[PDB]
Each structure stands twice: as C-alpha cells, then as structure tokens.
C-alpha cells in the first residue's frame, strides 16, 4: 500500500 | 533539462508462426522527458486499436513504455513501429523483423 | 527470498491546460500489481496483477485519497521547484518520487528508499539511515530544511520499516508461486546464414521471470564478450521477458560455439547449442 503524502517540497 | 533519446524494439511476444494469434510489442525507454509518441504499422498505415502499459522508469529517473497489440502475423504483411519524441528531429521508424 | 516493493510517482504540468498530470504505478519485485491515473474518467487505484484483486474495499478506497492527495501535494511541490529555479511559470516541468523497501528472506527491512527527481535529475534522496537527506542543490536545500522543520524523514521511517514491510509481506503470501518461484526461460539457438562465409548464431530466452538474466556466447568455452550482440532485456507484455544474444560465426564452425544462460529460475546454468 502506498505511503501517506508528504508536506510539499 | 535532461533530454534522453528513447530506445526502440519491436518483436512479437511469442516466436512468430504465420495465421496464427500473437502480440506486436513496441517497447520505449530510456527516454526524457515523458510525453512521447507511438504508433504500430501494418503496412505503412496507422494501427488504430493500440493499448500501452502504464507510465513507469527506471533507477536512471528515464521512463519506459510498452506498446502493444493482437495480431495474426502472414508472410507479406509488414510491421513497424514509429516513434516521435522531443530528442528526434524526425519520426523514427523500426521494422518488425521476425527474427530479432 | 529476497523481494522489494517500490512505488514511482510521476507529475508533469501543463500551465494553461489546467493541474498536473498525476500518476503511480506499484510495483513487487518486477511485477507491477497497482495504478492510478489522475486523467482517468474516474481516478482510483487499479489492480495490475491478479493476487491484488483479493484486497477489501477499504484498501482501495484508502489508497485512491492517497493518490489525489498526493497530485495535489505534487502540483504544490512543481509551483515551489520552477520560483526556486526561477524559471518560466509557462513551460512542462516533471517530478518523479520512488520510494519502498527491500526485505530478506525472514522479511525484515535490508533497506530503505524515498527519493525524487525534477526534470530527469536527482533532486533530493533519504539516505540509508532514514533519518536525514542528500540535497542536490541549493535549490533542494530549501526542501531540506523544510523537511528537517517537518520531521518529514519521521514519517518516511515510519512507513519503511511498518506498513512498507508488513504489506510486502502480505503480498508475498497473496501472490504465492508468482512471487516467490522464478520462471525459468524458454531457451533456443536460431541460424541465419549470413553469406557462404559467415552466419548468425542466435540465442533466445523467452518467458522467463525476473527479468534478471545473463546470456552469453562462448567459443570453445571462452567467452565471446567483444564479438556479441546482445538487446537489452524486454518485456513480452504477459508479465514475462525475453532476451537474445547473437555471434556471426564462419560457416562450418558453429560446432565451436554454445550458449550459456544464468537464471534464478533454472535448476542449473545451462549451456545450448545448435541443434
Ligand atoms: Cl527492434
Ligand atoms: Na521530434
């Protein structure tokens, strides 16, 4: 399963 | 921007045998950025039913594509793949050769 | 044995025709078993392999708002990288993310991966310890320190050493024969005279799985590396690949010539010749 999404770069 | 010049092979996925059911393959990669162009040809003539495998690269950040479509290959008929990119100044285009 | 689990990431603006395109593709090993597609009719999570398909509702729809979630998040990322590379707010940039881990044989974690390119180089990676980060530029500092604020290597830990192991492992347990046995390849040597002097040998290996494979061509059992023509390794589009290697040889030597293939999926190496 995929991971959570990051804070933007 | 990097630019990287796709590479191309086209081949069946089972060894060829005349009249009978197969897949014409146009594998893509290698190449940057990742809006390319892709057509299958039976001779000379655009293939109109043409699936491809989803967007995806490789360690090297290049991507790769595989192009592909049900065919019954015959003795005459010809088969290529074209393919236009940012890096080509003009379409490239690579015959089916049975034997490679 | 062995496995891995990678998921990669790609978006690609188009200013003036509206958000980036998203997309992801999952992969274990070299079988791709997930996608999803921010241009579809109806953007969801896809299963590409048929031991996925066994996974609830629940998992589906969890990682479909992942996914959109993430274009978003990528679409935010694509507006900071063209300001910190002053660059045209009218031109195609792209964003690539790779992330998963790799696994032993017992299933614990040997190493983890969570990395990103922008336009096709190396941007900023998570190095081997999981807990800081190698930035390219100065450019990729700002993420950096942006992530450092955020304790974002934290979270990217978290998911390799949990979530990224256990699933992997159910995957495995899922896929069964298709992920833990290797294919070994269909093998035969093909000949194509040339002229009344010379003709091809070719070796073919077809249907094998991974795609690892060594093919090589010996003359009088030494290796013929600077006189073989070898095609990179391809996929046939049935989740398995093929490979071919070829020598021109003089015509009536070719008794001199064999093929040997090295896969994991072969009880022992094997040697082939014309015939
Ligand atoms: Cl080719
Ligand atoms: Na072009």
């Known amino acids: 399963e995929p991971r959570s999404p990051s804070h933007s770069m | 921007m990097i630019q990287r010049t796709p590479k191309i092979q086209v081949y069946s996925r089972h060894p060829a045998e005349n009249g009978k059911s197969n897949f014409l393959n146009c594998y893509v990669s290698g190449f940057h950025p990742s809006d390319i162009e892709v057509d299958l040809l039976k001779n000379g003539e655009r293939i109109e039913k043409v699936e491809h495998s989803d967007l995806s690269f490789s360690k090297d950040w290049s991507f790769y594509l595989l192009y592909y479509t049900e065919f019954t290959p015959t003795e005459k008929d010809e088969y290529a793949c074209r393919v236009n990119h940012v890096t080509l100044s003009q379409p490239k285009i690579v015959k089916w050769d049975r034997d490679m | ?136 530029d100065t450019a990729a500092q700002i993420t950096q320190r942006k992530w450092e604020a955020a304790r974002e290597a934290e979270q990217r830990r978290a998911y390799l050493e949990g979530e990224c192991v256990e699933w992997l492992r159910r995957y495995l347990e899922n896929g069964k024969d298709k992920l833990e046995r290797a294919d070994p390849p269909k093998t035969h040597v093909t000949h194509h005279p040339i002229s009344d002097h010379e003709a091809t040998l070719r070796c073919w290996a077809l249907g094998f799985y991974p795609a690892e494979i060594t093919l090589t061509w010996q003359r009088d059992g030494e290796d013929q590396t600077q006189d073989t023509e070898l095609v990179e390794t391809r996929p046939a589009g049935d989740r398995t690949f093929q490979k071919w290697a070829a020598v021109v040889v003089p015509s009536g030597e070719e008794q001199r010539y064999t093929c040997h293939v090295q896969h994991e999926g072969l009880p022992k190496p094997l040697t082939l010749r014309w015939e």
């Open chain 3, 1 to 136: 044995g062995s496995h891995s689990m990678r998921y990669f990431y790609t978006s690609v603006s188009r200013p003036g025709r509206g958000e980036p395109r998203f997309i992801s593709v999952g992969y274990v090993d070299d079988t791709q078993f997930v996608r999803f597609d921010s241009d579809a009719a109806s953007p969801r999570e896809e299963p590409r392999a048929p031991w996925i398909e066994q996974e609830g509702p629940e998992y589906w729809d969890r990682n479909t708002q992942i996914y959109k979630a993430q274009a978003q998040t990528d679409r935010e990322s694509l507006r900071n990288l063209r300001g910190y590379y002053n660059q045209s707010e009218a031109g195609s940039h792209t964003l690539q993310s790779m992330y998963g881990c790799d696994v032993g044989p017992d299933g614990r974690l040997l190493r983890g991966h969570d990395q990103y390119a922008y336009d096709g180089k190396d941007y900023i990676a998570l190095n081997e310890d999981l807990r800081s980060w190698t930035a390219a």
